[PDB]
Amino acid sequence: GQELIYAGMPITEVFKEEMGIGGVLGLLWFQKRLPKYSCQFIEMCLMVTADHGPAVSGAHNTIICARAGKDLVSSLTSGLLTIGDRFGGALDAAAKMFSKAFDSGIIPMEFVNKMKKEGKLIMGIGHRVKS
Amino acid sequence: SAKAISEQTGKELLYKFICTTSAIQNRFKYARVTPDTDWARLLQDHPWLLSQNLVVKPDQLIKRRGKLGLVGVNLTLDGVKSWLKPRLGQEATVGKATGFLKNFLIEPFVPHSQAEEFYVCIYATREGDYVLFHHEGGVDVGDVDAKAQKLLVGVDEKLNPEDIKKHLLVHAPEDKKEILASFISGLFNFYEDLYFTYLEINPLVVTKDGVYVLDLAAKVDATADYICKVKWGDIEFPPPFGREAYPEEAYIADLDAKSGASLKLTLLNPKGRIWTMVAGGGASVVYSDTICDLGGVNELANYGEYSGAPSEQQTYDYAKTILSLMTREKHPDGKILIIGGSIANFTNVAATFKGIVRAIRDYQGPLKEHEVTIFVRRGGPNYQEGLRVMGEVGKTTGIPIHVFGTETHMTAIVGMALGHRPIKSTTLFSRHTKAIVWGMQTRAVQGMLDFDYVCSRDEPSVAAMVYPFTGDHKQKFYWGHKEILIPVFKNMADAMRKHPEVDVLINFASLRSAYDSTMETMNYAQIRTIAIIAEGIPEALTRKLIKKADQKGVTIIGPATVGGIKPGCFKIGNTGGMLDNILASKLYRPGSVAYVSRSGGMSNELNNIISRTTDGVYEGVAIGGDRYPGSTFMDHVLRYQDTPGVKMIVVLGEIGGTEEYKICRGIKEGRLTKPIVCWCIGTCATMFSSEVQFGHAGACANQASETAVAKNQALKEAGVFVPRSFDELGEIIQSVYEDLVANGVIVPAQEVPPPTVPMDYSWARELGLIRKPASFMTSICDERGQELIYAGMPITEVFKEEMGIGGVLGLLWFQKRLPKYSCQFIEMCLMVTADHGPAVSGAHNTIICARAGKDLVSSLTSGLLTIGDRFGGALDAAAKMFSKAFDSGIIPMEFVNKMKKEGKLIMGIGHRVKSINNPDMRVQILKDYVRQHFPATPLLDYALEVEKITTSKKPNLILNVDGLIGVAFVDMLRNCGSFTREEADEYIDIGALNGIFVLGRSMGFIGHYLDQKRLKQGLYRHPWDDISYVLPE
Amino acid sequence: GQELIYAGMPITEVFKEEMGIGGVLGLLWFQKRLPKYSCQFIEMCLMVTADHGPAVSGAHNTIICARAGKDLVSSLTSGLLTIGDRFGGALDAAAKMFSKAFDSGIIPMEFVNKMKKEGKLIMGIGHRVKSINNPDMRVQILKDYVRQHFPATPLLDYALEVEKITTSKKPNLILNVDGLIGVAFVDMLRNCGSFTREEADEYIDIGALNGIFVLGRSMGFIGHYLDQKRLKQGLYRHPWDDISYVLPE
Ligand SMILES: CC(C)(COP(=O)(O)OP(=O)(O)OC[C@H]1O[C@@H](n2cnc3c(N)ncnc32)[C@H](O)[C@@H]1OP(=O)(O)O)[C@@H](O)C(=O)NCCC(=O)NCCS
Ligand SMILES: CC(C)(COP(=O)(O)OP(=O)(O)OC[C@H]1O[C@@H](n2cnc3c(N)ncnc32)[C@H](O)[C@@H]1OP(=O)(O)O)[C@@H](O)C(=O)NCCC(=O)NCCS
Ligand SMILES: CC(C)(COP(=O)(O)OP(=O)(O)OC[C@H]1O[C@@H](n2cnc3c(N)ncnc32)[C@H](O)[C@@H]1OP(=O)(O)O)[C@@H](O)C(=O)NCCC(=O)NCCS
Ligand SMILES: Nc1ncnc2c1ncn2[C@@H]1O[C@H](COP(=O)(O)OP(=O)(O)O)[C@@H](O)[C@H]1O
Ligand SMILES: [Mg+2]
Ligand SMILES: [Mg+2]
């Protein structure tokens, strides 16, 4: 077009309506004009997940790669490719687990015990130091 | 179709599987004798042959053997051998059939009285299976239908044993009723379980000792093979007495059995000069009728058909069989090949004709030697291209081929070749009909939509598709020039629920699952009409479909049909084909003529004929070719009688069954008042010496009344407009029509032009009307062909030439057939670069990745992405640096000093531990191979001179493996003789050397991934004590 | 060390013993000195999987990427990342499927019917053009090799029985190259005598078969990258007339 359109909304309208990164993500991922608290929450998640030091599987790989004299894209992707199972997968895993448990109609205690019997740990539960 | 089995086959099955309280005697006591019998072995296997007297008779589907002196009764083995001496191998003429007596059965003689002989018969009909019994059995029973007690076991009914005693055994001796009732009960269950359609035991003997099955004649429903294979085993279906069995027939039968397509071949006269290769069960019979009407009966070599969209390969295998058969011996007047057919509904004429053309090319020498002339007539999908390739093969081979299309009357080529001429619910569909299509049939759906658009329908006729193998999704289609979406459902229940407007289902399920999916459809009350496409559904299953449909008021069109068409309203699947044919035959608007045919191909020929002779088709239905059509000729004729828009009816009948007589009855009763035109195909069968099963499963006359000749006569007598032959059908339709216009019965509507649909891109390019530029360009591999090609070399040749990995790389990377030493050197490089431990950047990243629980590709690429500069780059760097220096003309010492001045180190020089006196083995291995096999190594020589200098500074400044591979690879490209300097230089520049490292090391990295997984290594996190955190304040 | 060691074997010994690429792969992937027929068969697989034209998901991506002026590694990996499910996954899928079916003890007919009921198609069965009477040459090359050199082929034997069934429905439901490599590789791991059942099963599971395809096809992909560079091919932009834009209102 004569203007860039994000999920039916023109780029000028996107700015005029003060959508923000959260709002833009709403259009491009979900094709929705989300409530402003929802946009703000998305932005908030992107901020707390921004980084967690250079020791983690992904950061380490990017660093190695950067240090092996590679480009931004190569270095970034080399790190991103670790994201998925044992690294960064927990968000999806936790959401899926709890959603299943909830929707199954089992009470939290039944769920806790079900996991123990099945020999599974709860995703999204536990911390190395935080009490 | 129902096929006869030998007496031995039937008895073996009976003895194996019958379940009765009755003690059946002489179980498996039979011995088969042929002219090749090893009597010593026969006697070893059948010692009972010496235990009592015997009976001997041929087992060749010969009826009334006793009356022919062909049953030798109460003989010793010596007597049997003497009886066989003048008979075994002898020719015999039984009626109009003449064959050789080559297969006999020997069984124990069963002494009994004439009073101990009984007659039992079970046979299938639409309404169920009749069970016949007579107490006066044997070689003199006479008319069993009139005499014998008869009992109908309904379609899903069970045979009540009390009914056997009550209705059937009325005249049976009292002391034998219990045993007969038990046997008959078991016999019926056997008949059902093994899919018999006819089972006669005459005589059945019952003595003080038990039950004896003296004779057995039977037919099984051969279409039930997929069910009964296990029980039947390698069941053999013999040719009728008088005909021989040929291996070419068995070959075609095996092809037929392995596909939805229909492939049929029966040899009538291998030495005949008239051969046919016609598409369709209907058209093939019409062409045979025409040939016989023109006096060619004695010279007609075969009867056969191909239909149901066979592939190019299937058509090739079919055609090569015919061509081989017609070039066995020369005929003085040469030979003729008739390649005909209707205007096809969906068979791809180009694909099938390309198969035939390939066979013609392969047999061109013999065809010319045998003076073969070919005549072609065909219409249907891509027929234009089909006709072109036929014409072209004639030109290139010099074989005379005369090619015709839709403008030539179907059977006209026969006269040319022979020198006679020079060269329930009344309304099923409306303009509102919505259908569900079962099966992934996107082409048929698009064809329906193209028809709907030109018919000026408000909405598409297909509301949804059901396909159980995929998940629910939407499929793209075209409504004019507009792209639309049609939903596809995994489950039928979802499609029905979401589309309550649907009252029609078109079932494209294969024969294997059509029964269950049709029964499933009938659980949805919304569905009032079901079209069943599949050919080959067992008759017993179709009867169950009929029972349920009748009780639910559902109209079934099919099985074994293309469907039907209602101009202006609705088109069933492929019926009527593509837009070109819909427009040509004016199928976009209704006329006044309604028709019904068994044949799909012929229904589209009727569309053509009717469009040319009248105001056009009002509605047409193809009932299908099966013995029990879901809806009959009468069912549709009555709908047409009750449809005011219909002014005349056309019926294309067929040999087999007595359906057409219902029309005679309806006229006589005054129910049918509209003019009816009818022609029954299959008049040729009357002239054949043995029974012939035509293409349609139902096209076989089991009684005199079922012949086409008989039916045509009866219809003509009843007042139906019957032509002299199929050739005069068009003439009679036009005559009836013209009389109806004259009498003001019909008022032809003024013609309105229909909506215009764009040509699909596909056809447009094919006819070269448009040109569209390719966005891409490749030169290394071609997968489009009959074989995979790597840079001009076919995959088989790659293997034949023992190219190896190195050779394949030469092809795909350089598009060159490299010298074997060069290939081997490449393989050598991949081997030395395979791995170098887990400590290096890439291996480390792959390992971290595999430990982070990732897949092989993610883990491998995570490590590959470290390749390039500081890691893995040295091969390219060394090659480039040394090549530049060499080519500049500077001597090695000048180069060493230049680099020092420029503040650069020499790439490919240096090692942490390997000294000049302590060499790197990888370097040695390669250096030695290179020196021993390469014709020239100028750059390696230069590099070794540089090494001489550097090692005199520090002993570890040796030429390392990256330098050695780098310069040797340059020497290979430059001096192997496959590349110009320009080419060699380009390949180095574009990074072929980086490719070597990457490809080589990928093996090590995948190795590490597998290792970490097998070593069950947990998530890695780098220790904090190895990280200096220098953050702001 | 003073010498490079591949799974306990020094690099000179590797060359001296004429191990070849197949032999090297034996050591690095499985840590086994495989029979020479097994090595040669591996090399053969890597050759038939080398390439299959520029139309396939992966090749296309590599080409686009090369044309967008990127490096060998970026272009290769951009293509490799498509390998896995609907592209190149079939070898693993077929091997796993047939191995399960075989080991379950169900006869080929039971298996064929089980799949139909479960609403699943057989992985490694079917071809767009190759018929039972018009064979896939890659399948021929390998089938013939294996029949000649594999001492035992139980799973291939089972698969060919399943092929017998499927081809008698529709003639193009042949055992394709992904099915043929899949089952032959299983037969190799199980019957070459270098692996315990447990070992053979672990290797299939951890996706050694995906490795074969990835490694093999990497040659074709690098081939394409080089080709595009040499063909001095410009930046690609997909044409708008091939895209249906179904945006909200
Ligand atoms: C008992 C003891 C040895 C180990 O227990 P611990 O470390 O506290 O607990 P565990 O490691 O067994 O884990 C506790 C529970 O959390 C559960 N759990 C852990 N992580 C979980 C997760 N992410 N999701 C769900 N459940 C989780 C475990 O399944 C376990 O369940 P259970 O108690 O129902 O079996 C320890 O508590 C102890 O030393 N106690 C002192 C006893 C003492 O004084 N001894 C006498 C010396 S004189
Ligand atoms: C002088 C000394 C300190 C360091 O020198 P070194 O390690 O031999 O040499 P360098 O590290 O400087 O490298 C040697 C040369 O190889 C060159 N070089 C290194 N790697 C190279 C490569 N890959 N390609 C090309 N040139 C390379 C360097 O440019 C250098 O060149 P130059 O000699 O012309 O300057 C060391 O030799 C020494 O300790 N000597 C003993 C002196 C002694 O006994 N002192 C008295 C104590 S009482
Ligand atoms: C029936 C027909 C419409 C569609 O059938 P088709 O294309 O041969 O077969 P399908 O698309 O349904 O697939 C055939 C079988 O292969 C199976 N199959 C396909 N790919 C498979 C795979 N990869 N693994 C396993 N099974 C597979 C399907 O499950 C199906 O099984 P089923 O037959 O047991 O249901 C078609 O054969 C036809 O047109 N036949 C001619 C009938 C005729 O002449 N009609 C009368 C006109 S007058
Ligand atoms: N094994 C046998 N023992 C005694 N009589 C037999 C035996 N086989 C046949 N018969 C007699 O021979 C007659 C003719 O043979 P049959 O099998 O009925 O042939 P067809 O019906 O062709 O004439 C039978 O009706 C029966 O009387
Ligand atoms: Mg008899
Ligand atoms: Mg047919």
Report on this structure.
It is classed as lyase. The entry lists the keywords ATP citrate lyase, citrate shuttle, lyase. Chain A has 131 residues and is mainly alpha-helical. In chain A, 58% of the residues lie in helices and 3% in strands. Chain A is built from 7 helices and 2 strands; from the N terminus they run E-E-H-H-H-H-H-H-H. A two-stranded antiparallel ribbon of chain A has the order 1-2. In chain A, helix 2 (20-30) crosses helix 3 and helix 4 (57-67) packs antiparallel against helix 5 (72-80). The relative contact order of chain A is 0.07. Bound molecules: coenzyme A (3 copies), adenosine-5'-diphosphate (ADP) and magnesium ion (2 copies). The site of one coenzyme A (COA) has 6 residues of chain A, from helix 7.
Features:
mainly alpha; binds coenzyme A; lyase; 131 residues; acetyl-Coa; part of a larger assembly; 3 chains; 2 strands; binds magnesium ion; ATP citrate lyase; binds adenosine-5'-diphosphate; central metabolism
Assembly status: part of a larger assembly
Measure the end-to-end span of chain A.
55 Å
Percent of residues in helices of chain A comes to 55-70%
Radius of gyration of chain A: 20 Å
Q: What is the global morphology of chain A? A: flat
**Secondary structure tally: strands of chain A:** 2
- Biggest β-sheet of chain A: count, sense, barrel? 2 strands, antiparallel
For the largest interface in this structure, which chains are involved and how many residues does each contribute?
Answer: B-C, 81 and 80 residues
Ligand list? coenzyme A, adenosine-5'-diphosphate, magnesium ion
Binned strand content of chain A: under 5%
Structural class of chain A: mainly alpha
Compute the number of helices of chain A: 7
Order of adjacent strands in the largest pleated sheet of chain A: 1-2
